[PDB]
Design a protein around this ligand. Structure first.
Ligand code: NAI
Ligand code: NAI
Ligand code: NAI
Ligand code: NAI
Ligand code: NAI
Ligand code: NAI
Ligand code: GTP
Ligand code: GTP
Ligand code: GTP
Ligand code: GLU
Ligand code: GLU
Ligand code: GLU
Lengths: 501, 501, 501
């Protein structure tokens, strides 16, 4: 944590909201079409906005575990539900000591708008268990998450139609596998959609292909849709395309390692990788498979053979693209001036504070907002959810038919040409290309996740680029996204009676 | 209400049934394949029909509401469930003072067969609140519908697997939005499919695209599949096609305004529009998107600038196509002789009495039965229901695949032709037509509703036509449909053990 | 609120706990009699205590309500569940702007121990809606409490087997009547014990007789069982009995008005009555009937004809018995020295801060702790709960039999005496006393509440006086009660496996 700029997390995000609130407030009043045409529209609007911002529910939990050494310990744990204009709430579970109600109240709100950015029909939620996970044995961490699932389940803070958790900092597949198993074996025992109570699950447990990457893949697609738009690259003095760029990732977690993977593939170079014990550095480039193989073996990126330890801030590393994939409030009024990079891809949830945004705005530094960029996590989870509702491995019922249908479709183009060009004209083979033999049978689960994600990271980037052009926000994409989110979320409340009253 | 021919509504529809009962009774005994082959196939057919006819359940409600002026008023309200061979029951909620148990017992039965016509897997239900809706403020109407939802929910007359209401006379999106919200926030709180308890919902609440039109769109498709079949147009002395026809709609509601829009588009020309205060007239033609703009501004069609006020019965207006989109029992023994028109498109539920059919039959006037023609309402609702069960905006998971798949499919026809015609023969662009660029990504929700509706108005007309031919009913399409309905509904009961026993 | 001594409410009560924790900790280790006889008895004890004090659950609610002026307002509202070693949780709903999570987290904990004092089998809960109740119309307050009931019900914070609210500051019968009706008409629709979800209900809604008084009656019994124990009155230099005492109540609510009535009856004299706008005074005595009749007419005690607008603090009024029946943290490090009274009857929840206790301890001033004294509220509620479970007006099934049975019992003592004293001895009437003709039919609901309450305000004062003698706490009755509470609550956790594990 910084000290000059350590603003309250929930209020920080409220700040981003209130900015977007004013910018559409005019429009919201204008398409509102009611017979109370006045400032009655504006105060109805202002009221509905005042309903949106604050979380609807926060549950606070002091529950006992018995540690491995026979002793008793009390665990603090929270889960804020921000909005519910879309049931079920969505949002991850975070294991940290940083965990605090305001931090979960903040992340939950982010999940509300984050889903509105990428048109996932979930209300925002989040949750923290206030433990250093590296200080508990795996059997302790199991007892902890299972128990946390119960106490959440009993008070209605996890359920396939109510609230669907997912992984986050220091939680992953393993934790999610537990959360399902408790609720499948206990309270959700008769629930057919039980297993749909939580995403990020291991594939064998009902998870969806590529969800672990997903968030980092979406990070790729997000940087891409902009870095291939010279209208913005003209404003950063940078060339369109990944081919020649250099980047740096703070954090090497599920968002870091895979944001590094998907860029080091589709073009650019990794220069430096951070972690909560220090960074490594190499301007020549760092291979993600080597580094990961070194973090698996030795549990730290420090001392990488092919990369010098970097003395100094990872955020300040000279590069093209800065990807904070760590915790929040990392780039602040004091170090934001020194960032000597040109694209900020917020992988992490709110890693940049509003005072860093004003510096980055001035310094013509493009911050790709947290709302849009890591929405790949929720999006693939949103798929994982529909998978557990449709109870089928995607693609299975149809494969051998949009297959045979295609081969018959092709055989029509063929017979029709032969039918016209007689025998003499020859026989005219109509045959799938190489990049159509791989789709000849249609959508597999792998593919849907990719294109389904690819679509809406591309789809929702335009919706932002539209709005940044429209209201003339330029490189203030963060306000551009909150403008879209605030509008979509409002769209529900307005056409609803707003409350059962 | 007429005086000479005001038959009991439920018995009226029973009349239509009993007619269809006899006509298939032979067939039903015929494919019955049991070894009790006698005329006790007949009596267990005659028993199963006797089970179908009468409603299974009717709930009668005297519930208090406090009005706006602090005072108390008791509200009468009914919901008959006709059959349940398909759970969940389906059928709308009607707000009128005409509302009476017989009238709801009648409409409910209609919904049973109506769904059997267009192969929607719902049992028939309906409901009335016995209020003049203009005489209550919107806040009164809210507390009325919400309370009515409760008392229906508690006694098991609304639930996604039990009974799914929808709009009807003097109810629409707004009411449906309330019905969902109460049951979502109250009794259905844990129900994942809660919002699937009621159709006609606003799009933002889980509704489906085009449901408000839908019923009137289906009215278009219904008239079409017949008016484009000279085999019937030879029998009316009329030319195939919409291009030159003139019509008149009694009622300007959801069924009227949209039956007018979809015909005034796809050809014919509105001559006169009725309402519960009088009709307007103009042989030259009436534009729906002037008249609607006049009804929105001024709350009445009367005094339309481009149409004088018409001087007599709207049903008697000289025209080609008469579309009653009002309440029931409108064309009777007494005014049926003077209907000066050639095609009767029953948009409303049972607007023509059996004695009017006897005249229209004689007078070679084609009545397109209520069962078939307005089944667009239930059909799109049936879609709205599946949408709330599948929890996805249709088309989303696949768009960028049957897109990329098609572009690759095309690229196969291309490469294969080039692969045969060398560099000699050029490069052969294979490129979607204009029409096909709009489908290149596949089914959106807009499209599915259209084609999904278009298909079954077209699949079910040509189940009626090839029963009216079969048992030689000619222009008695009403008996033709009830013959289909009675058969499909039978089939369930026959293959079932018929009851818990 | 004071400034010098305004300690955190939760932590304040934790302070009272930690005191009691140490004092029994030895005993708890002592009768523990496990294999692991060590300081492992002590650390499993210290662990179980660490599980007890922190609340198990807190739910935080921002829910909207339409105000009367059509506008929207968001309502903050919380409900902490402290412990659950006894389901269902019990504890009131408080309407104030003082409402804050720490204040509800504090009161909830108090309810845990308060029930343990008077052997009510409920875990501690509490709840606040953060509104000034003056500032909302009754129709607003209805749509506020009903909505608050829903959001509490949905997340599992009200239910006959889960959590049973009750009235508190600025809530009473009316609010409780609403809470029942919503949950009876909505979520608890099929619940047979639905109306047992909340106590303090109006008699007609399932309430129990004397519950409104109850808390103030118990305040009488509590002062009594001590003021009639010269062993403590020798230590205050005061005479045993009520006959000659004088007393002052801060607050005139349900706890004030009825603590004043029950003492002004059974002996002593009211000298001064406080309220959030000032106090009245009269050393000669104040009649509760006249005052109440003044407050009903004029909505304030100020300007009482037979009593003097008192300059200065009500708490400092010269008297024998000071009854704070207001909000908490009223007697602090700064005004506690000035209290020139001798018995402090904590009617309100925690009206005295731990630094005031130190002074009062020194100044030999007997503080009758909040745990014990106002436990009449929960006790009669606990009865109201059992009444809604037994679904009978108490006494009904038996009246005409312990009646006829006693008249026959009497007739046996008679016939047996006559049988021995022949005719030479007369006829010997055996006849109930006047004080037995009123019990001749046995327990009515009125009586059970009285004696059922009377008993356990005795039976539990005894258990405190036992323990204050035992561990030699003298006039530290507060620590004496927490000692008893901590012990009873512990014996559940000890004999339990302590958790899901
Ligand atoms: N609330 C419900 O009715 C429940 C049903 N579902 C289903 O999930 C799907 C929801 O997708 P839709 O929002 O209807 O389609 P959509 O994203 O294409 O938007 C269609 C309409 O919903 C609003 N909207 C647009 N974007 C939105 C966004 N990110 N968040 C909230 N509202 C937005 C707008 O009013 C728009 O007119 C549907 O299939 C729904 O039936 C899922 C949970 C509960
Ligand atoms: N797992 C997922 O699917 C999703 C995670 N996110 C978000 O990305 C951010 C991090 O998430 P993950 O990558 O999954 O966490 P992670 O727990 O998998 O990885 C964190 C690693 O980076 C290090 N680290 C943590 N904080 C640091 C800090 N301030 N400075 C330097 N190093 C630090 C830690 O040593 C740790 O080893 C959060 O904002 C999270 O909400 C984004 C969407 C989905
Ligand atoms: N316990 C669960 O969650 C299961 C129920 N479903 C639902 O669909 C989703 C999972 O899709 P799948 O049908 O599993 O995809 P799938 O047919 O492509 O195979 C699933 C994965 O688990 C393995 N697997 C395949 N068949 C299995 C079987 N009968 N039993 C156990 N493991 C098997 C496979 O090796 C594969 O990697 C989940 O969300 C789930 O709710 C279907 C299977 C898993
Ligand atoms: N909305 C739907 O889902 C469908 C409705 N229907 C039926 O169509 C009819 C119309 O109802 P909706 O269009 O749904 O809503 P609606 O209530 O808005 O339509 C009513 C229209 O008919 C007028 N009207 C009432 N009584 C009249 C009378 N004696 N003479 C002339 N006009 C009169 C009304 O003033 C208004 O113009 C109903 O009978 C309904 O059962 C049939 C299937 C689908
Ligand atoms: N409702 C119940 O059954 C019982 C209530 N309590 C506690 O007793 C106290 C209040 O009794 P209530 O039930 O609330 O009846 P109440 O809410 O009607 O009493 C409040 C009265 O005291 C006044 N008041 C409030 N704050 C004051 C302050 N700082 N100074 C002077 N006057 C003030 C109010 O204006 C009002 O006249 C609270 O601490 C309550 O939690 C505990 C035992 C039983
Ligand atoms: N299940 C329910 O919601 C209703 C039935 N009950 C149940 O019984 C218990 C309450 O005992 P009670 O019989 O009400 O005490 P109760 O019978 O002594 O009522 C008090 C007086 O009011 C009159 N009274 C008697 N029964 C009445 C009734 N059913 N309704 C209105 N006035 C009546 C009588 O003259 C009686 O003397 C509660 O547990 C409750 O569950 C009482 C309230 C509503
Ligand atoms: N954590 C981690 N995951 C990997 C690594 N390499 C591949 N994956 C994962 O492998 C999964 C499936 O991989 P593939 O079958 O090769 O298909 P892919 O989706 O094209 O592989 P990637 O693009 O790297 O995701 C994806 O979810 C990736 O996240 C790695 O080095 N570390
Ligand atoms: N009331 C009313 N609604 C309209 C009108 N025109 C379009 N709509 C709305 O538009 C919806 C479908 O419109 P489109 O998306 O434009 O589809 P289209 O193929 O271009 O043609 P239509 O469906 O006839 O409008 C309808 O369900 C209506 O909600 C109109 O003139 N009056
Ligand atoms: N708020 C309020 N409650 C009252 C008042 N008078 C009576 N009550 C309630 O009604 C009950 C009936 O009281 P009583 O006539 O005294 O008979 P009781 O129940 O045996 O009480 P005791 O005679 O004192 O033992 C009381 O105990 C109170 O709970 C009053 O003036 N104000
Ligand atoms: N925790 C991730 C993913 C949440 C989810 O997939 O539901 C996020 O906040 O974006
Ligand atoms: N009320 C319309 C619609 C019914 C429905 O969509 O459920 C009808 O009777 O056809
Ligand atoms: N609110 C009162 C009464 C609680 C109850 O009766 O449940 C108290 O805290 O003691």
């Amino acid at each position: 944590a910084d000290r000059e700029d350590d603003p309250n997390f929930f209020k920080m995000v409220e700040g981003f909201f209130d900015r977007g609130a004013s910018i559409v407030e005019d429009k919201l009043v204008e398409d509102l079409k009611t017979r109370e045409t006045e400032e009655q529209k504006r105060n109805r609007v202002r009221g509905i906005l005042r309903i949106i911002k604050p979380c609807n529910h926060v549950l606070s939990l002091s529950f006992p575990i018995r540690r491995d050494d026979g002793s008793w310990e009390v665990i603090e744990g929270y889960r804020a539900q921000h909005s519910q204009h879309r049931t079920p709430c969505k949002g991850g579970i975070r294991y940290s000591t940083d965990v605090s109600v305001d931090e979960v109240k903040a992340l939950a709100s982010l999940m509300t708008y984050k889903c509105a950015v990428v048109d996932v029909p979930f209300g925002g939620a989040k949750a923290g268990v206030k433990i250093n996970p590296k200080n508990y044995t795996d059997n302790e961490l199991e007892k902890i998450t299972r128990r946390f699932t119960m106490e959440l389940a009993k008070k209605g803070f996890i359920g396939p139609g109510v609230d669907v958790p997912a992984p986050d900092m220091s939680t992953g597949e393993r934790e999610m596998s537990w959360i399902a198993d408790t609720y499948a074996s206990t309270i959700g025992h008769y629930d057919i959609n039980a297993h749909a109570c939580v995403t990020g699950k291991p594939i064998s447990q009902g998870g969806i292909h590529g969800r672990i990457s997903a968030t980092g893949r979406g990070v790729f697609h997000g940087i891409e849709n902009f870095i291939n738009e010279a209208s913005y690259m003209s404003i950063l003095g940078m060339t369109p395309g990944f081919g020649d760029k250099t980047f740096a990732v703070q954090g090497f977690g599920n968002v870091g390692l895979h944001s590094m993977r998907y860029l080091h593939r589709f073009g650019a170079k990794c220069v430096a990788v951070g972690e909560s014990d220090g960074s490594i550095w190499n301007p020549d480039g760092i291979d993600p498979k080597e580094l990961e193989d070194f973090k698996l073996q030795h549990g730290t990126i420090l001392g990488f053979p092919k990369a010098k330890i970097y003395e100094g801030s990872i955020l300040e590393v000279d590069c093209d693209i800065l990807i904070p994939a760590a915790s929040e409030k990392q780039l602040t009024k004091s170090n934001a001036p020194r960032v000597k990079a040109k694209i900020i891809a917020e992988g992490a949830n709110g890693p940049t504070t509003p005072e860093a945004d004003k510096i980055f705005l001035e310094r013509n530094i493009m911050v790709i907002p947290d709302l849009y960029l890591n929405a790949g996590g929720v999006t693939v989870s949103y798929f994982e959810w529909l998978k557990n509702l449709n109870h089928v491995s995607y693609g299975r019922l149809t494969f051998k038919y949009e297959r045979d249908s295609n081969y018959h479709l092709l055989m029509s183009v063929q017979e029709s040409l032969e039918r016209k060009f007689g025998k003499h004209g020859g026989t005219i083979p109509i045959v799938p290309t190489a990049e159509f033999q791989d789709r000849i049978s249609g959508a597999s689960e792998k593919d849907i996740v990719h294109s389904g994600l690819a679509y809406t990271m591309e789809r929702s980037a335009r919706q932002i680029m539209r709005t940044a052009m429209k209201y003339n926000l330029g490189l203030d994409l963060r306000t551009a996204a909150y403008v879209n989110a605030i509008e979509k979320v409002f769209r529900v409340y307005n056409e609803a009676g707003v409350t059962f009253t």
